[PDB]
Amino acid sequence: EKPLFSVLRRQARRNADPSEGVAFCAESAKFKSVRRAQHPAFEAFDRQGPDGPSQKPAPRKEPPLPFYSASHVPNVPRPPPPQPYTGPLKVREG
């Protein structure tokens, strides 16, 4: 948080190609993925994320509130500006 006047240390980048688990199968003498088969849509959703520019808000986990609550009011009349992104960078194909 505090001010810094110096060149920041080198930060290693993160990959974009996660691993996968496979197991042998004698019924075809081949290695099959351990993940459960699903719809392409589901597969895509889980992997990348929601398809489209926008989506619906998240559902409620906790039980409802026994009394009314004005949850449709923002925290502040004037939200602060967005903060910069900080983290590992994507690795470009060589």
Binding site: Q38, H39, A41, F42, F45, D46, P50, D51, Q55, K56, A58, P59, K61, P63, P64, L65, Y68, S69, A70, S71, H72, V73, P74, P77
Partner: protein, 272 residues
């Protein structure tokens, strides 16, 4: 000994067949009553929205204006009040139903058919009226977030309730991701087996997970936790523990005209 008994016993097999046949016939429509393999779609006609026409005019005329907007051009339609409200308010002593937003409307305009789902509804708080209803297209293969309602019809068969214990329905609706050509029907909570426990008793979504389509078209929200996401409770009245006020609580008595919080709420000396 009497002959009527004998006759009745002899005739019972025949009588059974009639009920069997009646239920079969009833079931035939799909080409039990509470089965998951039941469609819920509706088909209604519409009228075009004329140029230089206001909302008010249409409303006064006896119609509900609507528009259709995603995966296509913006289309304007008008649906009869007596036709729309009937679906909207499907209870004699109820308000806007949950099921209203969980269907597949096959609207017909001119020479075109649109398979849509209402998203946005503008209804009177007290009176039963519809001002404006928006629609969203549904295309096969695209993820569609839909809130499927739950039913607890089989409440009489509850040992807990029989014994005099209190039973509640926590979750009225469950979120799902529809990909298929049709929306799954309302879920049924089978409460026939719910015994009272000293601490508390509850039912989760893991039990109801078996009600989803076999083809895998529908799926619950990943955010949920089937191992801990309760849907129904069973406890004793006046035997609950004390808990503090939630941090995300907003007092409705300090809301501005604009929908903003009062200056007072930002003060140090502002409990809750």
């Amino acid at each position: 000994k009497n002959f009527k008994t004998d006759l009745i016993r002899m005739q019972w097999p025949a009588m059974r067949d009639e009920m069997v046949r009646f239920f079969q016939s009833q079931n035939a429509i799909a080409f039990g009553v509470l089965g998951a393999g039941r469609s819920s779609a509706v088909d209604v006609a519409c009228k075009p929205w004329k140029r230089f026409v206001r909302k008010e005019d249409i409303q006064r005329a006896g119609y509900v204006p609507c528009i259709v907007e995603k995966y296509g051009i913006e289309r304007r339609l008008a649906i009869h009040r007596d036709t729309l409200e009937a679906l909207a308010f499907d209870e004699q002593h109820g308000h806007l139903s949950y099921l209203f937003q969980a269907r597949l409307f096959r609207l017909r305009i001119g020479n075109w058919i649109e398979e849509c789902i209402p998203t946005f509804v503008q209804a009177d708080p007290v009176a039963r009226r519809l001002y404006f209803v928006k629609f969203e297209r549904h295309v096969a293969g695209k993820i569609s977030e839909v809130d499927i309602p739950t039913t607890m019809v089989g409440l009489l068969a509850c040992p807990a309730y029989q014994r005099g214990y209190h039973v509640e329905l926590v979750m009225p609706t469950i979120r799902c991701q529809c990909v298929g050509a049709e929306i799954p029907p309302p879920f049924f909570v089978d409460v026939s087996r719910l015994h009272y426990s000293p601490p508390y008793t509850a039912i989760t979504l893991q039990d109801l997970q078996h009600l989803l389509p076999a083809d895998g078209s529908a799926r619950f929200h990943p955010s949920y936790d089937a191992a801990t996401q309760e849907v129904a409770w069973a406890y004793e009245v006046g035997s609950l523990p004390d808990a503090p006020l939630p941090a995300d609580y907003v007092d409705p008595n300090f809301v501005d005209r604009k929908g903003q919080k009062m200056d007072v709420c930002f003060r140090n000396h502002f409990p809750n």
